[PDB]
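Q: What changes when zinc ion is included in the input?
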Amino acid sequence: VKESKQKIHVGPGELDDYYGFWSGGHQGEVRVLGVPSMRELMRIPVFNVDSATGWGLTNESRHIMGDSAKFLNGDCHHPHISMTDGKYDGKYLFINDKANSRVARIRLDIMKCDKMITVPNVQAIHGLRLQKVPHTKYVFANAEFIIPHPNDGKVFDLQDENSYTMYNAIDAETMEMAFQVIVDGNLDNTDADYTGRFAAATCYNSERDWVVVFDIHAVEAAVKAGDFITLGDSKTPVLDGRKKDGKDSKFTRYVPVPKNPHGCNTSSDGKYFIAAGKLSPTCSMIAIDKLPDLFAGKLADPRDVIVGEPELGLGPLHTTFDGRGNAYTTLFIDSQVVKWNMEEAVRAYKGEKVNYIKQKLDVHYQPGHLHASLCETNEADGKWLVALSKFSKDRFLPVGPLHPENDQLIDISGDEMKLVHDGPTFAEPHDCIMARRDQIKTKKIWDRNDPFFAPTVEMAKKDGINLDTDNKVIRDGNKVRVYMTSMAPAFGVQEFTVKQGDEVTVTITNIDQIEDVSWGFVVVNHGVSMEISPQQTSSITFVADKPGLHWYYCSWFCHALHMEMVGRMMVEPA
Amino acid sequence: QKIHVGPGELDDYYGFWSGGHQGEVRVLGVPSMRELMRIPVFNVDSATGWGLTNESRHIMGDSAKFLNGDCHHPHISMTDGKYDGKYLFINDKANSRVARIRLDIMKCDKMITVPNVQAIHGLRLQKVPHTKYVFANAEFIIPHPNDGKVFDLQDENSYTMYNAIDAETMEMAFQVIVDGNLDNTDADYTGRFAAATCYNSEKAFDLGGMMRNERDWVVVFDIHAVEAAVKAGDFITLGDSKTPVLDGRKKDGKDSKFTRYVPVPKNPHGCNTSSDGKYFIAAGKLSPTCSMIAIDKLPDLFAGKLADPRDVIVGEPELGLGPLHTTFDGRGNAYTTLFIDSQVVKWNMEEAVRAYKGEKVNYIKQKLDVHYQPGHLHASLCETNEADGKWLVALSKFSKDRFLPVGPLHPENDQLIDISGDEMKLVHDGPTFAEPHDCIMARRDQIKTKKIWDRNDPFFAPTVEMAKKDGINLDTDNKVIRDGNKVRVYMTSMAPAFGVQEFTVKQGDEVTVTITNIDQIEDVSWGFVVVNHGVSMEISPQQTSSITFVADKPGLHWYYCSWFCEMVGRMMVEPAWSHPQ
Ligand code: CUZ
Ligand code: CUA
Ligand SMILES: [Ca+2]
Ligand SMILES: [Cl-]
Ligand SMILES: [Cl-]
Ligand SMILES: [Cl-]
Ligand SMILES: [K+]
Ligand code: NA
Ligand code: NA
Ligand SMILES: [Zn+2]
Ligand SMILES: [Zn+2]
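A: The predicted holo structure follows.
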């Protein structure tokens, strides 16, 4: 007998035990929470435009975003942390954008998005998860929607032979495409095994849909051999993982699974891909150690890799793991989390009369994703569970027609799940991920060599500027490039003069060394705003389209004399 | 007092937090300090489409071109010196705006760019007889006209102005030219007087210059005299703005009808009306004091019955290093942030005034350490004559080691403090993003929200009129209206499907999609995203929302329901080469 009795209060001066990384949902950002307090410590802009830091306005952010900087929106769902040997290594966080078909990488040492890619020749990146073993070499990303190839407006027919969607592999370290695998059907969610050979995804188009399993080794072998095509103007190797006249691809196997299956979750012992049944009141358990036989043609029926199909309740959507042998599954219709024992389910599937269900806990209301601490790793610790519920109804004060999501913290450390905290959140975060405090190591101040602003350092070099010291205004036709340091009471350049119509770039290097002393820069009535934290260089470009005197000021309260940290841009009329 | 709000319990107060440099307003529950909602205002919100939709860009006007704001000062409208829960107003220092939020729908419903000024900072509301005016400070001195011929702040036509906005119409009411500049502002409990601190009586542009004078001032406005001159036509106008402009500067040492200047040290910052209506209290900042202005001495001051403007000061308590802001428990105590000493100091106002008269008395009751460098602070109901003395939030700018490390950028630390007793007790550290400067609390029963939109709501009434020109009944119609290279899609939305599940256009067509959520259930919000076109918006129950974008890519393009949602559809774009060149 072990009780669930962890402390959930983090009082003043006490620190949280875990980091939580929440998807920002339809709002487009990533959020850092402290767990168990469930307080938001930081917002990391990704696909949104952030007025505060200037993400989406600065030259450094728009460089990372590339052409997709033209979009002001994103739709995030699935945040995941890079792994080495099946354990979080604290290097990167990755997240999808369903709205504009992107994957972004966040560097966890600076807590900023440092790379972003628009996945070519697909629409809507939804499902996303990382290779676990030997490390996160690939980011695996589902493109949800079937589209014509090419999508040039000659063919709109979605049953055309060249209409399909694809499974996507991004090189985690370079954030370039690795390869794409054409599949049958629509892709929903995906996960990876604990060896690197296999990955799997639920599919909902084309009484039984499937989980498609990928032999990533076979895909890799084909790419190395050059046995691939390319699509349109993308150099990405494209492999064909569809069935042809009933004949399987080398790259894929289609495992029949009921019914419009949704969640696709790898157990922390590495034994199972568990697909949540959604319309079927079941989960289906695929034995990963039977997949080699499946691909080698030693099994009579792709159904032979199914070793469990527990009946759990109405509307199973997602599954997580406590590392003790239990799975935890959201029941969307019954509005519960059900705790069940995986090996007992496997024995039940063979016909033994054993109850594998341990507990059903009511949640409020209509849970979608759920996440137990370290569940994506072989160190799953069985301490905390968050269930992310879509309808909060009366659980919080009314706030008008739009309601928050209810993210409920549940103590799973003992035999009985216990609901301990209701956390309201904005714009349907949908899913989250937790890490131990000691798995995350952050920088206190920036490195002057940081790649995040290395292109700005390069630009300064071409102008002969030492960013650590210089306060200079460079004139170049109708372009004006202001460079300044900022510290203690004043901007290093307190006034400058331009001509109406000039394109002004302001680059600021914060040379304060004290942690937490962030600077800001706002140009009044010009739509210009950005952050410059200690030892960072930030830059922003705008046109001086209004004659006269225009004030700029430091936005980030950094000193008793904050109100007075200002400068003047004087714009001479045309 | 209950500190922790368990599952199934509700908060006792609403808190409305400024979004700081991030530009939104945030709704929190107090005392849990959890964020219940975000209200987009000056930011572009991917989730609801604020800043992308036609309804939101119509409210923002020309300023819809800006993707940023910088807000500090949220305030709730009042009737007879008590919150009435109708509106929240807030400033934008970055692009010189004031915005109004309707507290029944929890959305920004009006926005104004204040003409002929730069940087709206200080903002507060008339209390009595109700919030007729929104008072807003423009912080920075600029030339008039600001056409690029004169840049000198010492020119006789370089100045800044105090701004009054009609709260109900969200049009300018008047502007008062002042000497110096403007920082924070508050209003009395009669409707006659408003007051603002000034830190730049020097009209300088550099740090040393702004600190030269031993005293700047709080400028006091006789609003009755301003209104009297407006109705008498005794005003001018600047540029193309019709806003009445009154001159509240001194001439050759002679006071204007509209203003008086009370010398106060030094670069004073906070300007806070006591809840009993007795004082404007200016926080001394560079001076380790607050200056207490007796509001009942102001009529005599404006009537020339006092010899020296300092005669309206009846207290100047020495409190500590860097006083910035003051709030009130309704028990006769004031609470002031000490930015340098990093404390909140509780002090008794009537004893501070006695000490000013020389009566040696210790008016300081407690100094509580906060973490670290507090700016604003706010006690529950402090801006009303119902100040209840229960909760206090101090908003500190350096959180240092109070939270887990999250990289070089740190959160702010908004600390909840129990003040219901004689001893202040720190109960909760609340990390927040992007520097909320200030917040405002309301009792749960002071706020009444709608669960479902009204079909005649002015928020989308222009969209209803557009639909009418097309012969469209929005509650029923699922139709595609073609008009040259414009395509206007109108659909209803309710489970199980979009009312229009596919439509075809020509490459380059300008497509407007208008969706009416005809579902009646509450919490059933719909969303709409067009993949790879940067298009996203919310449609809540009985709302009509619309968004306009160019179909610049040939081929098939999926759209889907984001919120609460298969619920998908297809836009088919015929290639330009198959249509007239
Ligand atoms: Cu803008 S200032 Cu003390 Cu209000 Cu923060
Ligand atoms: Cu930066 Cu004050
Ligand atoms: Ca001064
Ligand atoms: Cl999943
Ligand atoms: Cl257990
Ligand atoms: Cl104030
Ligand atoms: K800060
Ligand atoms: Na990129
Ligand atoms: Na307006
Ligand atoms: Zn999901
Ligand atoms: Zn899901």
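Observations recorded in class: Residues A 77-78, 369, 430-431 surround zinc ion (ligand 10) (CB under 6 Å).
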